[PDB]
Amino acid sequence: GAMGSMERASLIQKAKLAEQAERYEDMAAFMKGAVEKGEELSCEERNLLSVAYKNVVGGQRAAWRVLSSIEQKSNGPEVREYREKVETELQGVCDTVLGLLDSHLIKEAGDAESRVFYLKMKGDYYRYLAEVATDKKRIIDSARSAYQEAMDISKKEMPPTNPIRLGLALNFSVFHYEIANSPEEAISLAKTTFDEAMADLHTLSEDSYKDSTLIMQLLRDNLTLWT
Amino acid sequence: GAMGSMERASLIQKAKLAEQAERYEDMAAFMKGAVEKGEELSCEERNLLSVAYKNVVGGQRAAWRVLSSIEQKSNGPEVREYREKVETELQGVCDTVLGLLDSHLIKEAGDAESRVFYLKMKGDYYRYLAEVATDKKRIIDSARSAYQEAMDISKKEMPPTNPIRLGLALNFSVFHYEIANSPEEAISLAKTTFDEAMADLHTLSEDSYKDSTLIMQLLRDNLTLWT
Amino acid sequence: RSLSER
Amino acid sequence: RSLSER
Numbered sequence: 001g002a003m004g005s006m007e008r009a010s011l012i013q014k015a016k017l018a019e020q021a022e023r024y025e026d027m028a029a030f031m032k033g034a035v036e037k038g039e040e041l042s043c044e045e046r047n048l049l050s051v052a053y054k055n056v057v058g059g060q061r062a063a064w065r066v067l068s069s070i071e072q073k074s075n076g077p078e079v080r081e082y083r084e085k086v087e088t089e090l091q092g093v094c095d096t097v098l099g100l101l102d103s104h105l106i107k108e109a110g111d112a113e114s115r116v117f118y119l120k121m122k123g124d125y126y127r128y129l130a131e132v133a134t135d136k137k138r139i140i141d142s143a144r145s146a147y148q149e150a151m152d153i154s155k156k157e158m159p160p161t162n163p164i165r166l167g168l169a170l171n172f173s174v175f176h177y178e179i180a181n182s183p184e185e186a187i188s189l190a191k192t193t194f195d196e197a198m199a200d201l202h203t204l205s206e207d208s209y210k211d212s213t214l215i216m217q218l219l220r221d222n223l224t225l226w227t
Numbered sequence: 228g229a230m231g232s233m234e235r236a237s238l239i240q241k242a243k244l245a246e247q248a249e250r251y252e253d254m255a256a257f258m259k260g261a262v263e264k265g266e267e268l269s270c271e272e273r274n275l276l277s278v279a280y281k282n283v284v285g286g287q288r289a290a291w292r293v294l295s296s297i298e299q300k301s302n303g304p305e306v307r308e309y310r311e312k313v314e315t316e317l318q319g320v321c322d323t324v325l326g327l328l329d330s331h332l333i334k335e336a337g338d339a340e341s342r343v344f345y346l347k348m349k350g351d352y353y354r355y356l357a358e359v360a361t362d363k364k365r366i367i368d369s370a371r372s373a374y375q376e377a378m379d380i381s382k383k384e385m386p387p388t389n390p391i392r393l394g395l396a397l398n399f400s401v402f403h404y405e406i407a408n409s410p411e412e413a414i415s416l417a418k419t420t421f422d423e424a425m426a427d428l429h430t431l432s433e434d435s436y437k438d439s440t441l442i443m444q445l446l447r448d449n450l451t452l453w454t
Numbered sequence: 455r456s457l458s459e460r
Numbered sequence: 461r462s463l464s465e466r
């Protein structure tokens with residue numbers, strides 16, 4: 001790692017600066033360096049890691065979708081070639097994230113909060129691989145298995161309003177609808193998740209209430225599209 | 228150049244795809260490859276080159292401004308170090324563009340339209356260097372000299388509504404106000420440019436009228452701020 | 455398209 | 461800040 005010579009605390013500080021500067025590639029590199037130090041990531045640091053790679057892969061996914069749409073309408077080699085270039089770059093980022101999770105974030109995640117967070121990430125980055133795969137079958141199964149393990153732990157160890165649990169269920173429901181050809185599973189998961197969170201809002205402070213209802217909005221938006 | 232093995236036509240096509248995909252770093256790399264083939268850039272291709280590098284350096288400038296503001300308020304080494312990293316990357320992009328212009332876009336620009344376009348670019352990229360310089364004196368003089376040569380040619384060879392001429396005068400006026408501590412020069416240039424364009428709108432088609440009045444809006448916005 | 459966590 | 465060509 002080219003970040004191996006930098007102190008962990010300096011990598012975290014620079015990741016926070018990169019976020020403020022909207023330099024998400026730098027942010028991701030700094031957070032990869034921090035992970036590779038081999039110590040726990042705190043809740044804040046896990047959020048930094050996730051935000052950084054979500055923004056990097058998000059731009060790649062948006063580009064890939066533009067190019068894939070152009071390639072489809074065209075049906076010279078240039079559109080295919082450039083789509084393949086972006087696709088390879090996207091796969092490389094996903095492989096990098098999955099490698100951090102497998103060596104050794106997940107096994108070293110010594111409580112439910114941290115293990116669920118990383119297993120949700122594992123589902124997400126296999127899902128992004130599935131979006132461009134054609135082999136696609138294996139990736140889909142890996143994403144479902146990671147999401148489901150995360151769900152099982154989260155249902156045992158977190159309340160139904162916990163925002164990590166809510167965002168996990170939201171993204172698993174998107175997986176079912178958009179990737180796995182399981183729209184009924186998507187609807188069932190989003191609806192039960194929404195309803196069980198609603199019935200638990202009375203237990204929350206004003207600030208936690210805001211956290212939970214933000215994700216609940218996204219569940220509602222999908223259910224409105226899907227039904 | 229890593230683009231030396233790609234056909235010129237394929238580089239131009241991929242630059243257009245990269246623009247649609249909002250992949251501006253890729254777009255700039257493709258257009259650098261096309262320039263280095265050693266042939267003319269058409270009006271469309273000059274616009275592609277300019278859009279690509281404007282977006283790349285634009286993100287760098289925005290990041291540098293965020294970090295410089297944080298560094299100023301702080302007055303460990305981390306903010307300075309990271310600001311310096313972004314600054315060096317920004318200078319490298321500007322040096323790359325100035326190198327394309329000097330070897331050999333400007334000398335090979337065999338008419339006024341193309342020479343003015345490239346000299347405007349030369350002023351712009353020296354101006355971006357000046358924003359981060361402290362030596363700053365030399366850069367300021369280089370920017371002013373390029374802009375002024377472009378102005379002299381444009382006044383002799385283009386009508387007052389030509390959008391390249393208008394955008395040149397706009398950016399030279401920003402140079403005067405923000406870089407050269409010459410706010411009166413900025414006001415004088417923006418006002419004469421606006422007034423002379425206005426008096427020439429009657430000569431234009433609906434489409435050229437739209438081109439010119441768009442830049443005239445930016446002249447107006449600055450004059451409203453400056454007076 | 456469906457909306458993921460954002 | 462002043463506005464350049466955009």
Ligand SMILES: N=C(N)c1cc(-c2ccccc2)c(CNC(=O)c2ccc3c(c2)CCO3)s1
Pocket residue numbers: 019043044047048051459460
């Ligand atoms: N520097 C950052 N970006 C963050 C820092 C922290 C933090 C700070 C101190 C202590 C613990 C955590 C965050 C907490 N996470 C959110 O607030 C959040 C809200 C909505 C949402 C997401 C995240 C994901 C998409 O939808 S984010």
Ligand SMILES: N=C(N)c1cc(-c2ccccc2)c(CNC(=O)c2ccc3c(c2)CCO3)s1
Pocket residue numbers: 043044047162163164167208211215459
């Ligand atoms: N046990 C809880 N309920 C929380 C505990 C903490 C925490 C832990 C240690 C230190 C400081 C704060 C939270 C911080 N908040 C988030 O991480 C967060 C918020 C909104 C959100 C997401 C994440 C993703 C989707 O939207 S939440």
Ligand SMILES: N=C(N)c1cc(-c2ccccc2)c(CNC(=O)c2ccc3c(c2)CCO3)s1
Pocket residue numbers: 187191194219220221223224227
């Ligand atoms: N296949 C299903 N399960 C559904 C079928 C219908 C339906 C039935 C008969 C007539 C018209 C529609 C549903 C109605 N839509 C919702 O109930 C809805 C519910 C909860 C919710 C949101 C939207 C957002 C957040 O929480 S849902």
Ligand SMILES: N=C(N)c1cc(-c2ccccc2)c(CNC(=O)c2ccc3c(c2)CCO3)s1
Pocket residue numbers: 246270271274275278465466
């Ligand atoms: N692919 C692109 N991005 C472009 C392609 C062409 C083109 C196409 C065919 C023939 C000739 C030129 C453009 C012409 N230039 C503008 O229309 C323009 C308008 C406003 C403005 C700027 C540029 C700079 C900032 O303010 S841009």
Ligand SMILES: N=C(N)c1cc(-c2ccccc2)c(CNC(=O)c2ccc3c(c2)CCO3)s1
Pocket residue numbers: 270271274389390391394435438442465
């Ligand atoms: N002689 C003229 N008036 C023009 C001729 C052409 C052209 C030349 C060859 C082929 C097709 C078209 C133009 C294309 N348009 C631009 O390049 C353009 C438009 C708006 C704008 C900028 C640039 C920068 C600021 O805002 S303009």
Ligand SMILES: N=C(N)c1cc(-c2ccccc2)c(CNC(=O)c2ccc3c(c2)CCO3)s1
Pocket residue numbers: 414418421446447448450451454
């Ligand atoms: N130092 C100068 N030159 C100016 C001084 C004053 C002034 C004088 C007395 C009282 C109040 C203001 C000016 C008024 N503002 C404009 O005239 C203005 C003109 C043209 C124009 C735009 C704005 C936008 C596009 O074109 S300009």
Ligand SMILES: [Mg+2]
Pocket residue numbers: 040108109110
């Ligand atoms: Mg541990």
Ligand SMILES: [Mg+2]
Pocket residue numbers: 267335336337
């Ligand atoms: Mg020539």
